[PDB]
Design a protein around this ligand. Structure first.
Ligand SMILES: *[C@@H]1O[C@H](CO)[C@@H](O[C@@H]2O[C@H](CO)[C@@H](O[C@@H]3O[C@H](CO)[C@@H](O)[C@H](O)[C@@H]3O)[C@H](O)[C@H]2NC(C)=O)[C@H](O)[C@H]1NC(C)=O
Ligand SMILES: *[C@@H]1O[C@H](CO)[C@@H](O[C@@H]2O[C@H](CO)[C@@H](O[C@@H]3O[C@H](CO)[C@@H](O)[C@H](O)[C@@H]3O)[C@H](O)[C@H]2NC(C)=O)[C@H](O)[C@H]1NC(C)=O
Ligand SMILES: *[C@@H]1O[C@H](CO)[C@@H](O[C@@H]2O[C@H](CO)[C@@H](O[C@@H]3O[C@H](CO)[C@@H](O)[C@H](O)[C@@H]3O)[C@H](O)[C@H]2NC(C)=O)[C@H](O)[C@H]1NC(C)=O
Ligand SMILES: *[C@@H]1O[C@H](CO)[C@@H](O[C@@H]2O[C@H](CO)[C@@H](O[C@@H]3O[C@H](CO)[C@@H](O)[C@H](O)[C@@H]3O)[C@H](O)[C@H]2NC(C)=O)[C@H](O)[C@H]1NC(C)=O
Ligand SMILES: *[C@@H]1O[C@H](CO)[C@@H](O[C@@H]2O[C@H](CO)[C@@H](O)[C@H](O)[C@H]2NC(C)=O)[C@H](O)[C@H]1NC(C)=O
Ligand code: NAG
Ligand code: NAG
Ligand code: NAG
Ligand code: NA
Ligand code: NA
Ligand code: NA
Ligand code: NA
Ligand code: NA
Lengths: 649, 644
């Protein structure tokens, strides 16, 4: 049971610093700039259409002492304002780069940016030779490289952190940074980008506009994931093509029985999750997985729910436990259900419902108490879930997410559920929707109620979400607007901002809380327990095996109040079992089934597919080893990919 | 100036009726059902996707004494819940028809509807043999006839007010009622409606599914407006086709020359918006003849939202021929334009009365669907009604970002010709009593307890504190009827975590105690863009005169604000004519001028398969304009004896 009253109020009251901002208009954004810099930026923005020239003044405040004091530096951005859609363009964590993209209050020949490379302590002003259509994008491999699309659909690039800009191509519809500062972009065949569905050209430049190469024609769309480049190509019908050499060579995606709607759910250096819409136009599709070449796919999960307008799904990478992914499917009776995989798409199981839930006490029927974990599918469906599932690799096994059972009331007002074993087991910890953040690599989790009333409570947990305490951080409740944490692995600082509205005018205020005094002592051996990740194959020899590697994790004991949450850790290999294999091309695991079985339609014919112009023949026991799985010994089904020395089809 | 003296708080306190609702979950909707019936329904709904089966219980409360008392009748809809997207399917006014379309808690073979034809005083339940994909639709000619699309894209029709249903066609994408119980609908050949865009077939049935007729192929979309049927056809580019004979014959829209949208259409005329070639967020409004075929330039640089295509186009239903929308000025300022002759001529909206004005823009922008789609803080579009002649209430902003972020509420009493800022900040508002009562409620994050009301058509406002426990505002609903005096406010308190819902019904009967006398009215004429005295009071060639309650009036009006007069027609002038095909009116200009690119070549268009030649002075009479005499410009459509 939880430890009642380790007194925190005194240690938090003296570490809570309020700042009132007078006469702020528009939306107010707050952000920490850097780890251990002390810098917090507060900026007001305005919702103004791009084409409209209007007058306005954004306000800008800066703290250099961790939120205790703010200096008005609006004079730096005199006679400009920033649109809410743009906000701040903050570079990578250790770069110190911040860019404010603004519009001149009276109008001008182009936009105006304010550039800082010292954690927002000094800005320089630069007039753009164009009006930005969207926010400027940093190159992932070089924060000095910026690209921006103009309102004239021109592609502009800067090599020196936005100081000097050059237009490298006109009539561009979409542009994206690839790897090693490559730029991919689409261009017109004629008039409008909207009217030219399926007739765009995909272009590549590897030297920031000096030379170009057309890598695709008749393009519907394109995207990037992991080491893979994807393009939807119009033949009257759409097919998916994959490239792992930045478009020099393409191969059509090979799916058993490339369709009208596709989506890359996730992709890394090892594999691809691909969603393909079911024939006709229903609310569900199918998840396919590929090898590290991104070409040959196999059926992974049926009836995967997606929003027909936008393609969002509940697909969630559980980043706090290797190999774990969660998403939502439509059961046979059209109930929503959360499925979870612990082997990177090889096998999926129903998410387990909490034991002895309040739902179990009132449910007049089973399956009513199934737990649906809310993500982008719920959010796009306009449900009241203010945050997707939250996890981070440093906080091993911790997942925080909104969830609902099979009641309309629960769907309307989700609750916050906590998992400490990467999603295998869940407990309802907070009533109603919340905003939440992880600090101190999981040593501190904080949540704030999301409702119509003004709030004055911080809820926090120091034992990975098992026990919660409430801290009244003000006597004047605020309509909550934002929650922002200082970055860093050992973070203790968090800022809340919002406003009072006793009459018609909003008075904005920020509260910065330092949790330094709460976690005084360092955890010892009796403060932890040990746990092994869940395995779907039975046997003590298979407990704790993740993709062929057995490992052991710690977990803070319930009611713990201590720091030094050691990094959860000698590697050992497991024997091979079914959980270490995906189904092969043409095979699948029926719902609730452990073994792969050949899809019925292919039972008659030989399994063949196209691989870079060469037709291949597949003989298989129905299995192929999961990319990245270091399994050895045990079960080893056989497969052979024989080249037929023939052109495709 | 306003008369603050008549103390109203005593006359309103005894006429304010509170009802507290226990354990309401989900979204809460409230609606009056019928003129002088006394019926108010309160229903809880849930935001749940269509395909998902879940458990839930909607709650249903009914008042039969004008909101003083509510009876829990949830048992009527036991074991069902209603989706927020569906709500209630309310038949036409005075029909008495209400239908609650629900799904069964836990799933079933089809939906379940609860049907009433006596203003929701008695319901009967019917199990549907299908799951409805969208809300059921009443036939405008017969409220017993219903239409519904199933989640399997089957087309279902009922002839007996939803008691018995028949499936008349499968694989249907969209279906709509025509004028005489005709049904137009599109169907694909195989697969998906999304994938078969531009390859759909447009079908018609005039006998509720007994027989069908294919009236269009290669269809992208279709729609109905006024007496016009529209279809978008995929050729290499998409173009719009019009039919005035229910699809037996079509004609392509003839524009002097891209994406096409129908802004509005009635029995006389079509408003068409045409997107610029490069998609820069603005387009051009074109107007048609009475056939919907021949179009001419009406308004340039018409702003539209780049994704949904919404514009600020607003029909001022309280004054004939008046429309307002937003355009992009030469320096990319937003501006409101107004027409008093149904698109013939547009003028800049006049600056608000009594204002202190720097920049070039103290101009007043009236907020509508373009502002709403641009995510501005505008909770309601402009509000007007035909019975409340000349009254328009709308959100407006001047040309500073602060004003755009927090618009104010403006009042016009002459159909939008002149405007005054009457309320600070965004509000919800409603008109009842044919304009005798206007009510407004603040839109903000804090709970409210004040009702703002006007009894002189918006010229003077008073504040009434209707409760000591402020509520987070949810809705404002007025009793229907020309002489209505009751409104309902509902919302919830949330002192802790739980919402407690409550309704407040206010009766203005004691406020408007005495009846207005002759000294309570003034008379006015609608604005005319031609300055002659022979055109005073002329609206589209027809003379009329209006009344208006004097400022600070607190009395009940029983007269139609249109004075009863023998009808008289006006002489023709420029305001009575559109520009002809190939002509347009420059900004602020009264006379039409030929578009420059066409000044050299012969004006030609295709009309019913035959190529036609147009010689014109630049004008054509506005469709519906009852003008006679006066100006008579010449035009001739000469057949060229050629196919097209
Ligand atoms: C789902 O989220 C997890 C966690 O973020 C992703 O896993 C991580 O992916 C990165 C890059 O692929 C891995 O980095 C690698 O780092 C190691 C060690 O420095 C290096 O030897 C490799 O060459 C590689 O650069 C990282 O280790 C890995 N972390 C874990 C816990 O697996 C995963 O990629 C996501 N899934 C998908 C499909 O994207
Ligand atoms: C969380 O926020 C707190 C502030 O509320 C941070 O603590 C502050 O850190 C600064 C910089 O390390 C400390 O300043 C230093 O003082 C020494 C002399 O003692 C001086 O040489 C340095 O130049 C600097 O001024 C400051 O004292 C300290 N304030 C408090 C109240 O502890 C803290 O670093 C933040 N991060 C974490 C992880 O807690
Ligand atoms: C995987 O396992 C689950 C059980 O854990 C299987 O679920 C079952 O699904 C059927 C529907 O396919 C449920 O059935 C019946 O539905 C009818 C409606 O037509 C209803 O009238 C009956 O009362 C009944 O509920 C059944 O209840 C359910 N079983 C359980 C224990 O929940 C699922 O089908 C399996 N998947 C595969 C591919 O085999
Ligand atoms: C606004 O709401 C009030 C109630 O707050 C409505 O007043 C009520 O209307 C009915 C019908 O006129 C009245 O009831 C009965 O009328 C019959 C005559 O058919 C009579 O014999 C009964 O004795 C009874 O009065 C009811 O008394 C009346 N007023 C009140 C205060 O209860 C009113 O009709 C609503 N609408 C308008 C436009 O004011
Ligand atoms: C714009 O609003 C007005 C007011 O509703 C419409 O005018 C009426 O049209 C109906 C149906 O044709 C007639 O029955 C009424 O007699 C008209 N009333 C008035 C005051 O004109 C008008 O048709 C609407 N739509 C368009 C496209 O203008
Ligand atoms: C910029 O702001 C200053 C206030 O410091 C103001 O006086 C000045 O007019 C502005 N400059 C321009 C060019 O508008
Ligand atoms: C509501 O419906 C359920 C299922 O039909 C039934 O068991 C229950 O008795 C009903 N409640 C009432 C009050 O009739
Ligand atoms: C058009 O008329 C308005 C109102 O009289 C005037 O203010 C404006 O300057 C005119 N516009 C142009 C472009 O001349
Ligand atoms: Na870098
Ligand atoms: Na951009
Ligand atoms: Na009445
Ligand atoms: Na049902
Ligand atoms: Na009809």
């Amino acid at each position: 049971d939880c430890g009642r009253l380790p007194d925190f109020i005194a240690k938090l009251t003296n570490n809570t610093h309020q700042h009132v901002f007078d006469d702020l208009s528009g939306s107010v954004s707050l952000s920490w700039v850097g780890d251990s810099t002390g810098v917090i930026l507060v900026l007001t923005t305005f919702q103004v259409p791009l084409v409209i020239v209007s007058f306005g003044q954004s306000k800008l405040y800066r703290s250099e002492d961790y939120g205790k004091n703010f200096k008005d530096i609006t004079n730096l951005i005199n006679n400009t304002f920033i649109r809410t859609e743009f906000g701040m363009a903050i570079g990578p964590e250790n770069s110190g780069k911040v860019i404010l993209t603004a519009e001149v209050s009276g109008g001008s020949r182009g936009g105006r940016v304010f550039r800082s490379s010292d954690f927002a302590k000094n800005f320089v002003q630069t007039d753009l030779p164009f009006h930005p259509l969207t926010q400027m994008m940093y190159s992932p491999q070089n924060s000095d490289y910026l690209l921006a699309l103009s309102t004239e659909n021109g592609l502009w690039v800067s090599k020196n952190f936005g100081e000097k800009w050059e237009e490298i191509h006109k009539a561009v519809c979409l542009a994206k940074w690839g790897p090693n500062n490559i730029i991919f972009f689409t261009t017109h065949v004629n008039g409008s980008c909207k009217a030219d569905l399926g007739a765009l050209e995909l272009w590549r430049t590897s030297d920031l506009g000096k030379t170009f190469k057309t890598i695709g024609v008749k393009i519907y769309s394109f995207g990037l994931g992991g080491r893979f480049l994807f393009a939807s190509v119009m033949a009257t019908t759409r097919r998916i093509h994959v490239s792992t050499d930045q478009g020099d060579t393409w191969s059509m995606a090979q799916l058993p029985s490339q369709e009208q709607f596709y989506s890359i759910l996730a992709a890394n250096e090892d594999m691809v999750f691909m969603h393909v819409d079911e024939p006709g136009d229903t609310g569900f599709g199918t998840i396919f997985t590929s090898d590290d070449r991104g070409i040959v796919y196999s059926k992974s999960l049926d009836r995967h729910l997606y929003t027909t307008t936008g393609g969002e799904t509940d697909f969630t990478n559980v980043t706090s436990l290797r190999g774990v992914y969660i998403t939502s499917t439509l059961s046979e009776d059209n109930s929503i259900q959360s499925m979870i995989t612990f082997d990177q798409g090889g096998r999926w199981e129903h998410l387990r419902k909490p034991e002895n839930s309040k739902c179990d006490a009132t449910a007049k029927n089973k399956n009513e108490c199934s737990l649906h974990i809310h993500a982008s599918y719920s959010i796009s469906q306009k449900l009241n879930v203010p945050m997707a599932p939250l996890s981070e690799p440093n906080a091993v096994g911790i997942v925080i997410a909104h969830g609902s059972v099979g009641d309309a009331i629960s769907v309307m007002v989700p609750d916050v559920y906590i998992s400490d074993d990467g999603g295998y087991s869940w407990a309802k910890m907070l009533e109603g929707p919340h905003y939440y953040t992880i600090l101190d690599s999981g040593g501190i989790i904080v949540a704030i109620e999301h409702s119509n009333r003004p709030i004055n409570v911080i809820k926090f947990s120091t034992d990975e979400g098992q026990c919660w305490q409430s801290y009244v951080f003000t006597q004047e409740p605020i309509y909550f607007t934002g929650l922002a944490s200082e970055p860093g692995a050992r973070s203790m600082n968090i800022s809340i901002w919002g406003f009072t509205e006793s009459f018609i005018t909003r008075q904005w205020v920020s509260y910065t809380v330092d949790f330094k005094d709460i976690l005084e002592r360092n955890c010892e051996e009796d403060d932890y327990t040990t746990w092994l990740a869940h395995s779907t194959d039975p046997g003590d020899y298979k407990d704790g095996c993740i993709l062929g590697y057995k490992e052991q994790f710690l977990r803070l004991r319930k009611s713990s109040v201590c720091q030094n949450g050691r990094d959860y850790v000698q590697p050992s290999v497991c024997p091979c079992s079914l959980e270490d294999f995906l189904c092969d091309f043409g095979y699948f695991r029926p719902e609730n089934a452990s073994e792969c079985v050949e899809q019925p339609e292919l039972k008659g014919h030989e399994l063949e597919f196209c691989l870079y112009g060469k037709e291949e023949h597949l003989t298989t026991n129905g299995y192929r080893k999961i990319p990245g799985d270091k399994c050895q010994g045990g079960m080893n089904p056989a497969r052979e990919v024989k080249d037929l020395k023939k052109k495709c089809t």
